[model samples]
Target chain A: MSLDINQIALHQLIKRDEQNLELVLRDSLLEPTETVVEMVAELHRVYSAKNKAYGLFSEESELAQTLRLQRQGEEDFLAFSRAATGRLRDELAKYPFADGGFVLFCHYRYLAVEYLLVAVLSNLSSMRVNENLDINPTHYLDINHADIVARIDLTEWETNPESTRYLTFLKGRVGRKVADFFMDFLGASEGLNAKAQNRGLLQAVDDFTAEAQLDKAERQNVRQQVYSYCNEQLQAGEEIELKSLSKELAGVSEVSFTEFAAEKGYELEESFPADRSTLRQLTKFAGSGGGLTINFDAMLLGERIFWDPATDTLTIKGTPPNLRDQLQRRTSGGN
Target chain B: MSLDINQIALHQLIKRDEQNLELVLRDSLLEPTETVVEMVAELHRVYSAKNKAYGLFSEESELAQTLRLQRQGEEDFLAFSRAATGRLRDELAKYPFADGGFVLFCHYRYLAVEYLLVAVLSNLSSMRVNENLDINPTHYLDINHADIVARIDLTEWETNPESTRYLTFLKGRVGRKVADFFMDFLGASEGLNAKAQNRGLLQAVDDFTAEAQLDKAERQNVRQQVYSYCNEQLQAGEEIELKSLSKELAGVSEVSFTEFAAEKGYELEESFPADRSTLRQLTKFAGSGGGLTINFDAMLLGERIFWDPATDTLTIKGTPPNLRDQLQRRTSGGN
Candidate 1:
């Protein structure tokens, strides 16, 4: 949130005419005034809290070309934003179900790291009194729920051109259809395996526990503490700070947990957002979310429990008599 | 609910020792006092509100022979109940997951029709003040949620000996496992297709609407009215009273709706309970129950919508843009 907005612009993407979605391009960039800077800071917080997918610009993408030019100071920010807006509009027009929104382009800096963000935001209506003292219906961009968004860590992109994690964007809800258009418009594709990274962290923890020679009860307690810490960060939409986590488990190991991870050649990012489902694998065969929580012993995974990853379903063949009773009571309605 | 309890009794079925579930049988019938009658009446109401399945005693069943013996005055009611309790205990012992509860038997007369109801009720513990002014631990039967139940219309069995529905029982909230032992003990086998009966009523309504030559709006309104009436009764755990429903319709058609159903040989029972799901077919492709409600145009089935009877699932392809927006936002959580 300690970011400074260098430049900002907004472009209108209209779907009034189904056959021809209009890209009302902005010719000029907005001044980075106090109010404008504060708005961008607020948006950055919202963007950071959300779970996003990572990707890099495809070699054949025109938006990538503009991005390079803009970074090189050859192309102006306003010009780049205008061209990107047009490209996004054209891509959106191809999708019959895509919505039209006001696209906000921001060039900012956070923690001395340069960054750029583009987001499609909805305009919500509200009642406001004009200077004439007459109350009139007004529309303002709703910043909380971005329809689509993409952020580029300029520092990372420049310092490590080979890094694919430099770019991150919101994939949004269900099908890949909605995300595909936004990703395609950005000349980007999903790349990172967040799940694998989380799994690696869990694996590292297991190795540390074994190497440290912790007793059964101690090992179990340590695993639980690690799970709890990661889950808290996940719920808060924050990244797991390895240094802070090591401090949390100060005396658990002779060497710090992060030092153990580093000593074991575990390739983990210093800090990365937690993947809750993968982190749960460290504790037990359990799940908790969306008003549903199910837990079972790890040993029961294959015997009493069955999970089909393809269908994203769990089939417990032999449920407890208590659970069977409840399910029957529910089914008793014959619904 | 103005039923008179002629005879009542309670038997304790204990599962204290896992190896052997003990059945503590009562030697004498409970006095049908005011409070005891009220409790039975309350239980009867709860039983009626719940959706139950229909069946008849299997010819090979020992319980059927006893039922006939008791009816023919060869066996006493007390003797029949004791033998039935022993049979139930034996059948229940076969199920490792089955629970033990206090069984209540009631022989009552409602609307001049003799009936017998037997239900497995759990005994709940609570603190009660004893006559010595000291609070003591006591247990009372939980009649609200019966574990298992069976009811017989004695009048129906005697007058219409061939009628299978003379015997009705709670098929229950789950697998036939829970209800099976009870049915097997009673020597009952499921017979009636309640779903089919509900479907037939819907078909009859469609025919009547067509024959009446009602306009599109009127037909839709009439169908909604019929659906609304049935759902109300269904929710109340009451049967669809044909004559009363006909009275509700007043003069929608030349002949009463029930009379039309009879004239067309629809074969609908004079008062059968409505099935919420099958009745839904009368309106459109819609479902409302168990914290979920989904509605779609009837025409969309098999095209935009796919139903798999085997999985009991509905697959919706190419959802609306508005719904897609909400879904993507949800998926943004990366859960």
Candidate 2:
């Protein structure tokens, strides 16, 4: 099969630096958790206030109604806060959080601790600032913040002391392993060399499944397929083309086909999918530790022309032959 | 006294259509109590959240400390929101909230609201669009949708019978009357008209006090000095030189002096004071209702130039010879 030599070389470049790049990816992906936590903690505090001020139950007296409306506004405020936080988180994730990928990932670790501290302990450091020049120290910024905090705090204060205490129990059953797997996966010895890049993909997918620790056979089946495709791509030396995959491959992977490309050096071009399921999964994983995987098939097409091993040249001399035909094929959505 | 001819011309232009302009000023100055209520309530909500999250006592939190180092990096977000809302309120006071000014104000309002809401309410609303389309209704684009929603929601609720009672009380106590007084004093009545044009000095000062409602004594004093100066100018029949006054007026009144000139045709020159105590009073008045009064004598330099009808054609082209040297005597510590 003809491959785009330049594309392949580019892939090699990524592969060569995969270890560092994976660190970058991990760091960048996790960077916003701090912001998310702070925002969530803030939201949680607002929710508490809303409950105290507005409560779900209606009040009958004039004073109560006034308070109720005020509280309702608080509830609406909570809704607004959550929506805004979610939007910000989503947008932040859309772009790579860090510029110098791996360095960004490392930075994310420090940020993660900050996030955990603010979200769980509600002990947002004195470094936190609020308008009116007076912010409480224990504020959460958003739901993710709340969830992370709840998970951490509950685990710490679990009455049962058993693993089955609070939401942390659920998170422990899910979150801790997920976080651990991601941390380990990032810290793994099988660093991302060019030849081992494909392995990284498989491992990343596997890590997600292991972290999630699902029960349903369907989920496990999906996981198997996900890891299998990554393995197939490694063995076949064929890049994975997420879009061309069968419907059966849908749930197998934790990310959308587009995101897979994003991870593998393809600049994002298309609009988001209309479907919500893929989005939810992608976000959930991004929120926790399920890094997405990508198939690199298009790299082959570019590689075919760019490769000049006789001279060890990586640049293309000019446009490839059958340029018009290629253009026509591309316009026709030919892969 | 000397006056900038160009400024006088600008004043004439704005004054050409005085009645309509006054109405605009009146309308613009009218407080959008509903908006203010919403903003205040939201601000309180965020404050409460910050208090709880940080575990800091609200009363103990120093404004500078709270906004600067207390919350750490989160200060930017809090400051951004607070500044945005406060700016919007001021902007809305001078222009329709639906106009470009209003739009800008709304933009800030939402930014502040979203920041606060997220800080206080529910982080769940912070989800990405693709993640939870069904439950998450807010999607912020370039604009903060959550803030906008909160603003719109507050506006709507402001009309509810129970909500209206407080709004009504607020309207009478602070909104309508104060706004009217503000418009009258600031000469905003003509919609950036003759009263508003070439009013940099007055505007600079006026910006400090528009939101506040003065007590009877303060208002009475303000009314007296303004009325006297304007009546003197109207009698003289000449335009007030705003820049000169900007150079001369002392205290809070000087800030609004330009607007005062616009309304009643006060041809004030640089003959006033600008003391720290007065400036502080002005600042406080801008922030809240107060008892500060403008000292016209301490501020006034000399009688304005006048054209005697009998001798009509442009008289007093120069300062009165006696007034000039005596006015110079009034200068202390280098006027």
Candidate 3:
């Protein structure tokens, strides 16, 4: 009559999520690149640990096989982290992202981190499945490093300026990279859902929109169409989300912004700005921001937003308002 | 380059293990078992399909884990499976287990029906760790599942019924129980090296002596102990061999011959001949002669001759000259 470790851990994680509880942090970063990398690394570690633990229980019995199944459940955790990071990053990238925005970024980042940790650790229950097969099942059972990984969160850290500075810097990198990564992932995720004709993404958007008191059905429709287009690209075996005129026509999801930038070979830091001056600097960084020398149409096609020196006044041609206006409006609102 | 799916899969699993793979499984299992019972049901269907694929991976991983580590590895795999199964069953028992281990069991059983399918699918190279990670200075990535379980020899199917039946049965069960209902996994594998010492059952035998040879230095001590205990009961740990004992005592390996047997609590079917009355019945079924209801311990453990109560006759074990007599005479000749 031993406790079901897998069920208990899983319940704990879900409960923690509901209650906004987080695990300890092993490595916290402020930069977006570092943050995203950290998240990916931690995720990999979690998944690997679960797999190893399940491996321990993999004997020739119903019980052992059960452990393997439990281990495989870790996949959902991976999917959740990937989706959550991508979604939050997209949302964050849309704003001005100043000091307060940075603080909010940390909050969401921490939340995502917690989810990832719980998602990873819950797999430990399966590692102990061997207990059922033995005469003295509990005698030899001791959770390994894998179980340790599951029980303890790596995100728990005392907040301070030094830690904050480190986190902030890492957050910046995480922000930029996550924004970029999120965009690509979102595009791919959308494309997958669309190809499968999965209504989950649409339903999710609708639910979120309704909760936010927005136009639920319309948002869902827009989200569905965007996701479909992305899925189509993925189905076609294109890992990279290049630009397509159809996106503009249908108004692609937030992922399109990053995909467009990636396609154009423009750095997200250059394409998206934190403030008006920063935006101007980034524009100049992309070459000639005097009057929008870059072509927005090309940007949508996954082309880089480069400067044209022929016209001293930077002038961008055919820049659709969706991406540009969205960025502008978001930045202005923050100010 | 084409993606190495197996390697990637294994790497993913191992990375998670480092971070608590069990926790992930536990969390996922808990969620569906709780609020999403219906979703758990649907997940079972998906698992039924995916578990088959994953089961094959688990089987291969088990074999790989064992052979490399040999005896200790096998014990580890066994212990882990017991704990994992026990934990998962506890979880499923709370709610209806309809969508969990039961469905997974079916899935695994189906997959095991096609053994070759599993082998072909798991291309050996596909499971190897990335070359870069394996050799990198900063990254000491042991991406191999070989550390987890020993490889099952295919030849065992043809030569050893025990091995064949055990492995096949184990694989199917793993698919059914462990994979079906994802459970929280602890460790059943950590201290298998000390199984005998930990079990402490052999102390009942006055002549029995158990010895472990850990390294080069311990080899001499083990050798001396084996020689000293030559004519008495001697059992060597994994690394030790009774080569020196060959000069004085009989050695048993690569085969199971009864050295000592006792009636514990249950009856074990014995494969021997003594009672002609029952032999005649068995002969009718098999069209063969000379079968008896001899005690399993007498046949497999103790060098005891079979006795028939109905006829009040006794037959010497195994051939005319038993192994005990043969060995005694062989050693006596040199003396």
Candidate 4:
């Protein structure tokens, strides 16, 4: 009834040290028939109207008047989104997923669409030169239902190399964009920056994980592995299949996957339907990639990464260009 | 170096159960050769000018100008009073007083004279019909130096039956009047009324007395006797001689005179020079009737006495026509 979509998504995304990316793609994108276009429009109508009611559109009388009249419509749209998300979560809960990774991917998809809608509205309000003109764009520019569905092609994402590369790119982009939009929204409303919000969310997750009776180093190791796994998938342009990814993680990391899940408060049973369901629900909004994925090595070394939006790349924060090259060369060789 | 004259006087006045009163009279009145007339005039000049400077005499230009000219003069007078009082305290400290009673008595005398001057100026300022009158009264209306000396009558105060009765009345009046003046001054300057000031002063005394290690009941008993003794003396129109009063207190009270002195932090040395000196200074301003005396036995039962100014005859403080016969009959029997 009361859900923090962001927290849920974050938990799910970082829930396991395995390749559950394909599960996310399957459950979130391919399984849902609703187009990105429809979800975006719905999110836009609800949020924009709410924002206008909150007096964010004081500069545009026509927009404000339009939004005020559409208050009931905004409420209806919000109800629709909640119902749709809840139903999807319920369906995903029944699946025998090793982790809530797919559930989080679905939630992140919802948020990503919503974020795109918000960004579109922000751009529209800024571009509005005259109140007389119809400023509503009616459609998102960069993305649509068909394009996302094609990108999330189940068989291709599962088998084809190019499709896997594209899916990885999409996952990274969606992850980064969703976090960016949420951070921007938080910044506008609550005066909290991305860094602080990230830190707070991480700390809360860490506290929850700690209560699951895992040692500090083990917890950190599990988290590190998850981060590395996501980073490798994004960098290698590869699809992360759930079963193989779990096996790979179990082999690479010293910690056992079954033990780790149990330590994370997952109920270990032959039939883990309830446990899986709860985990899925809890980690619904979580995801990996885009700028939201931190470099595990950099984190371990206490180094910060800064995103260069113009170049679509990340540079070590606070390092001069000359020093950055030297530092990169020195760090690239080994741990 | 910095002495509160009122506090010093109060401390000495209530210090011991001995001949502190006689020491006070001798030190303050007869011992100091300065005439009441001269002292009053000096006090009047300083205080009146200061009051005018403070704009109390703003109605008259001449008085204001005169006071403005006397600003330096007022400062000089204050210096003189301080020096004179300090010298007297130094001298009294060397005398054989049991406590600093005599020193305090002298200080109180100085304050009393100052208070009289202040009261006179207040009255003159209030009653001013014109700006051009000689406002100085030259002498106090009721009593003067000669009258005080004659009444003090060191030998009579020590020898005569009537002298003892007269001294008691004097002691009570002086005690009450000095306290009254100090209270009035405090009220005008510090916004502290007599009741509040009395409580504070008593509390301070109680704290000091507590340090002397007397039990509460014993301390209270001693204070009661002192109060009753003073009250009886005032009613009887009697002079309370330092030596005989101590003996009378020793005779009446359960605690010995020596024990009471010790309880008041007095050194029980045979030659109590410091103690006597202190007592003398403390009781210096303590006196009442000009030449009037009353029957001691009549006073004990709460009968009042009055002095006729012209004839110098003693009368009841307030004699009711019907109650006179009844009171006379009650008090006629010898103690």
Q: Per-residue alpha-carbon lDDT of model 4 for B299-333, expressed as tens digits? A: 21222422322332223233332323222321132
Candidate 4 DockQ score? Answer: 0.00
* Residue lDDT tens for model 3, B145-193: 2111111223433354333121321113334344232212211122111
TM-score of 2: 0.18
Q: What is the per-residue lDDT of model 4 for residues A1-335, given as tens digits with 9 covering 90 to 100? A: 12112211101121243332232211222222223324334433333222111001122433224323433356332333333334433333333442432121222234222121222111000111112212221211221111111012223322433221111111123344433322222222222122232232333334434455465356556555545554455444343333443565564335645455456644222111111111221212111221121112222122342332333332332333322332232113212
lDDT of 3 by residue, A35-67 (tens): 233333444434332211100111243322332
Give the range of the ten consecutive residues with the poorest summed lDDT in model 4 chain B.
Answer: B120-129
Give the higher-DockQ candidate: 1 or 4: 1
Error of 2 at B129 (Å): 26
Q: Cα lDDT of all candidates, in order?
A: 0.67, 0.27, 0.25, 0.28
Q: Per-residue lDDT for A212-309 in model 2, tens only?
A: 56543554455446545544543443444545443445454566544555666543222111222221121111111112111111122233223233
Candidate 1, B222-276: lDDT as tens digits = 7778888998887777788888889878598868887787766777777777887
The lDDT, on a scale of 0 to 1, for candidate 4 is 0.28
- What is the iRMSD of the candidate numbered 1? 26.6
Supply the TM-score of chain A against the true chain A for every candidate structure.
Answer: 0.75, 0.19, 0.17, 0.22
Choose the strongest candidate by lDDT.
1
RMSD of 3: 35.2
**Cα displacement (Å) at residue B233, model 3:** 18
CA-only RMSD, every prediction: 23.8, 31.8, 35.2, 40.6
Categorize the docking of model 2: incorrect
